[PDB]
Design a protein around this ligand. Structure first.
Ligand SMILES: Nc1ncnc2c1ncn2[C@@H]1O[C@H](COP(=O)(O)OP(=O)(O)OP(=O)(O)O)[C@@H](O)[C@H]1O
Ligand SMILES: Nc1ncnc2c1ncn2[C@@H]1O[C@H](COP(=O)(O)OP(=O)(O)OP(=O)(O)O)[C@@H](O)[C@H]1O
Ligand SMILES: [Mg+2]
Ligand SMILES: [Mg+2]
Lengths: 471, 478
């Protein structure tokens, strides 16, 4: 019989011993359902995922919930299949946990609904799509320097409290409300307050009618934090394949997946690697990332926020995830402190859509000139500090004068930022951004004050702001 | 008999390993022969690892360990109000026993997505530099971060004292503090009358690492009782950094591999599990709330350190107090650039939200322009802004110790500052201007203050301007 017994309990890791010749396969789901036999026990309802085969008919598993109350010797049930989540049209408008069980109090999913296994191989080489088109977002910096690619993979890098969540909300507001396809949001290791606020905002805006939401937050154990993203990806994969529909996939923090993997690695008997990460950091990340792709039968565009620990961009987790993205935007605490939000780094941010044959020579030349001027202004800092402003040549003085205004104009007021500041916000087309930056580079607006360029929309609002200030 | 009885194999550095205990469950309390309590963490194949919650000197190999049948718990109740207790709930002030008759688990799940509500109730701390540009709402969590000797404890104690005339329970948890410092804090609370509604949990630096690691969970579990009864709770954690240090001590004593800065891998989980449990409950859950004010101490103002970044990544905003500003006379030392409140706007009254919306960004820009201005000349508009606004905002945000200022007066003072009424007076005169303005308001403009108190909105269109002009007419300058 497929009956197991609990041998060891070490935090979120449990060892189970089975009868000889009937060990469950790797990634299978095991269930523990125990009722308190007396007053010195508590009821248990827990699911486990097989991780390793240790020999002697013993299996090491990872728990999906708290292991408090477990007694070594309990009975374990082998389900014979990996974790299966409800899939299909029934998931639209619902909120699910890691196990695919709804948490929105709207009712239970019927037991006969179709379910798909979480773990599956990645699509092959011959099934991939390759075509670059610009996804307009209405953000000046993104549209000018690092355009987003429709159907591609977009990553947002930033430290703690820099603004990537606000950028995600702004992108959702700008794009998802008129996408017309299917939207999927996966919250991995983030704030329950933020999740609740996003859910209520979507209900108010009516987007929730075509959005499936899956939540595993920081209060959840590492197993749930690892598998919630895979559950969301499993739903998105079905929506891509079985219906051929365009899918919006938002992942709130993909770094928590590798963080939970590193947390659980030490108890699995693995030797430490690099600064403390698991040896399998690259393969585990690749197995998840390679499933998020656009294919010939459906396109998935995904926007992922990536946390940078200790503001160190050389950390292995941020370092290895760079190769898995087509367009990246890097946020900086230095720019956040200056008050120039969204604090996107204009130089480190890169995209593969920034080519003359994709965005046009008019756009490409302006972007390159802006980057060159900003680089020169960055270089001039030491000589300015140790020699004074008056010791610069008239070329460098003009470079600084233009670069400060360009840097201030890169800032923008967001719609979702109205809760922080009373300004309503704006949406700026790519043509307007290019024209405004070209006019600034041409020297038309050299007589306006520096601060008139901060937190505005089109180039005209600079003129009205200067007039309001009294020029 | 090895079902409910065990024998100690190893003792050392506050951890023990025991044989037997066949039916012990993970997280259960165990009791040694001396009466010292313990916690079972690792249920290995042949032995059980136990963490000793107290003095381990009297424990020797061969001593008996017996089960208790209960998961780690602390006593909670109304009788705990006004007392000073350890993380285990044992009275420490010496005023006799505690008559609590209920217990709550140390490890409890946090409220779910559907059990929460958006924060909409302001928490007035009585400090302008907080209530104006870093608002705090009920159910929010907001850490105070800065170097040593910067005023974090003063801010916390003032926030606790300001809640005298509101129905909310306050919990002060001291992690790693000196016993004399805790005694003085308790004495100040007693003098100001906060002990009528305050519970103090202490774990000094001389206590073993397990108690330091366990104390904040005991405090939050104590607050959970009142939160789920439908009341409002404020909880203060004094050094989450010292909690992290104690947890690192315990982990390396357990020989778990170290990560960045020798901290264990689950150092983020340790703090997130605790801080995530503070929430604003919905009407279905009873409308209760728990507000948390964790503390983090930085080294030389380095906000990029591992523990500061981890704690910032969890909470809803940070108040950064700078030592360079604490010196040279800016005593509140609020750093507007590094500070932020993620529940801004909703956590303020309508008047304050209407007036002080852009102050944080304005002072950030002013600091940037002041830094840049050391190199060269300035335009007319730059000279107007930098001096007529930034210098006066910096001066008017300053506040003295133990001087609560009502929000109805704060809205007045920032309105006068923002509308440009302070442009014609010297920078050094603004504090006397503020004092005389409060006196003039109390003497003559009580109806504006009453209107703001009753409606939470601005009093008038032009009567406010008239009153400000009337005060300026009698204010003696310089
Ligand atoms: N573009 C912006 N406009 C206005 N305010 C902003 C902007 N970006 C960030 N902020 C402010 O800074 C805060 C940063 O919080 P946010 O959740 O966006 O950060 P984050 O990068 O996601 O951090 P974390 O890792 O802690 O989740 C916001 O709550 C808001 O107060
Ligand atoms: N607003 C204020 N006005 C005047 N003095 C103040 C103010 N705030 C704090 N102080 C003084 O600053 C000193 C340090 O304050 P406090 O003890 O609160 O700081 P801390 O950061 O908690 O210190 P520590 O690291 O020693 O615990 C005290 O002498 C206190 O009286
Ligand atoms: Mg975030
Ligand atoms: Mg202190």
């Amino acid at each position: 019989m497929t009956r197991g017994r609990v041998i060891q309990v070490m935090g979120p890791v449990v060892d189970v011993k089975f009868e000889n010749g009937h060990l469950p396969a790797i990634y299978n789901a095991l269930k523990i359902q125990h009722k308190a036999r007396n007053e010195n026990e508590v009821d248990i309802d827990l699911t486990l995922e097989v991780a390793l085969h240790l020999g002697d008919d013993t299996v090491r598993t990872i728990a999906m919930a708290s292991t408090d109350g477990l007694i070594r010797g309990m009975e374990v049930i082998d389900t014979g299949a990996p974790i299966s989540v409800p899939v299909g049209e029934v998931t639209l408008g619902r909120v699910f946990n890691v196990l695919g069980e709804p948490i929105d109090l709207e009712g239970d999913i019927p037991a006969d609904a179709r379910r798909d296994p979480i773990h599956r191989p990645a699509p092959k080489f011959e099934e991939l799509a390759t075509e670059v088109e610009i996804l307009e977002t209405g953000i000046k910096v993104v549209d000018l320097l690092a355009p987003y690619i429709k159907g591609g993979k977009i990553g947002l890098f930033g430290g703690a409290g820099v603004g990537k969540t606000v950028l995600i909300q702004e992108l959702i507001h700008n794009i998802a409300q008129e996408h017309g396809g299917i939207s999927v949001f996966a919250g991995v290791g983030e704030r329950t307050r933020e999740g609740n606020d996003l859910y209520h905002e979507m209900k108010d805006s009516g987007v929730i009618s075509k959005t499936a939401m899956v939540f595993g937050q920081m209060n959840e154990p590492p197993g749930a934090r690892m598998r919630v993203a895979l559950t969301g990806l499993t739903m998105a994969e079905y929506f891509r394949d079985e219906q051929g529909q365009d899918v919006l996939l938002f992942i709130d923090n993909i770094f928590r997946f590798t963080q939970a993997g590193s947390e659980v690695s030490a108890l699995l008997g693995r030797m430490p690697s690099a600064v403390g990460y698991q040896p399998t950091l690259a393969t585990e990340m690749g197995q998840l990332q390679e499933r998020i792709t656009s294919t010939a039968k459906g396109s998935i565009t995904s926007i992922q926020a990536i946390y940078v620990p200790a503001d160190d961009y050389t950390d292995p987790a941020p370092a290895t995830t760079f190769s898995h993205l087509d367009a990246t935007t890097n946020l900086e605490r230095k720019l956040a402190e200056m008050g120039i939000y969204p604090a996107v780094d204009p130089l480190a941010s890169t995209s593969r859509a920034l080519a003359p044959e994709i965005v046009g020579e008019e756009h490409y030349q302006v972007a390159r000139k802006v980057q060159q001027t900003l680089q020169r202004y960055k270089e001039l800092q030491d000589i300015i500090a140790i020699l004074g402003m008056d010791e610069l040549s008239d070329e460098d003085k003009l470079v600084v004068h233009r670069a400060r205004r360009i840097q201030f104009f890169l800032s923008q007021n967001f719609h979702v930022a109205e809760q922080f500041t009373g300004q309503p916000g704006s949406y700026v087309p790519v043509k307007e951004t290019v024209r405004g930056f070209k006019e600034i580079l041409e020297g038309k607006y050299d007589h306006l004050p520096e601060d008139a360029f901060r937190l505005v929309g089109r180039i005209e609002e600079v003129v009205e702001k200067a007039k309001a200030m009294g020029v | 008999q090895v079902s409910d009885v065990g024998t100690v194999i190893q003792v050392g550095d506050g951890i023990a390993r025991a044989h037997g205990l066949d039916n012990v469950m993970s997280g259960e309390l165990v009791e040694f022969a001396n009466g010292v309590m313990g916690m079972a963490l690792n249920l290995e194949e042949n032995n059980v690892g136990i963490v000793i919650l107290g003095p381990y000197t009297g424990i020797k190999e061969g001593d008996e360990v017996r089960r208790t049948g209960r998961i780690m718990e602390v006593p909670v109740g109304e009788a705990l109000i006004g007392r000073v207790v350890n993380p285990l709930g044992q009275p420490v002030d010496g005023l006799g026993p505690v008559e609590t008759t209920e217990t709550r688990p140390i490890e409890s799940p946090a409220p779910g997505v559907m059990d929460r509500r958006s924060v909409h109730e302001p928490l007035q701390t009585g400090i302008k530099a907080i209530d104006a540009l870093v608002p705090i709402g009920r159910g929010q969590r907001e850490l105070i971060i800065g170097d040593r000797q910067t005023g974090k404890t003063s801010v916390a104690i003032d926030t606790i004292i300001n809640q005298k005339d509101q129905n909310m329970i306050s919990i002060y948890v001291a992690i790693g503090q000196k016993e004399s410092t805790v005694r003085t804090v308790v004495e100040t609370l007693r003098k100001h009358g906060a002990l009528d509604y305050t519970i103090v949990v202490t774990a000094s630096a001389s206590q073993p690492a397990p108690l330091l690691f366990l104390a904040p969970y005991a405090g939050v579990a104590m607050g959970e009782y009142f939160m789920y009864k439908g009341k409002h709770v404020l909880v203060v954690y004094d050094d989450l950094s010292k909690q992290a240090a104690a947890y690192r001590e315990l982990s390396l004593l357990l020989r778990r591999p170290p990560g960045r800065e020798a901290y264990p891998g689950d150092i983020f989980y340790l703090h997130s599990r605790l801080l995530e449990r503070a929430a604003k409950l919905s009407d279905a859950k009873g409308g209760g709330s728990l507000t948390a004010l964790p503390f983090v101490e930085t080294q030389a103002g380095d906000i990029s350190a591992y523990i500061p970044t981890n704690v910032i990544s969890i909470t809803d905003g940070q108040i950064f107090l700078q030592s360079d500003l604490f010196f040279s006379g800016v005593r509140p030392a609020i750093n507007a650039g590094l500070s932020v409140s993620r529940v801004g706007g909703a956590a303020q009254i309508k008047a304050m939200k209407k007036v002080a919306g852009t102050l944080r960004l304005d002072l950030a820009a002013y600091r940037e322009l002041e830094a840049f201005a050391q190199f060269g000349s300035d335009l007319d508009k730059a000279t107007q802004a930098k001096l007529a606004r930034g210098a006066r905002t910096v001066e008017v945000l300053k506040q003295d110790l133990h001087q609560p200022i009502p929000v109805e007066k704060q809205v007045l003072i920032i309105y006068a500052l923002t509308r440009g009424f302070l442009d014609d007076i010297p920078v050094e005169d603004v504090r006397r201007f503020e004092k005389e303005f409060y006196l003039f308001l109390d003497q003559n403009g009580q109806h504006l203050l009453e209107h703001i108190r009753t409606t939470k909105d601005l009093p008038n269109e032009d009567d406010l301007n008239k009153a400000i002009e009337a005060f300026k007419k009698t204010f003696v300058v310089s």
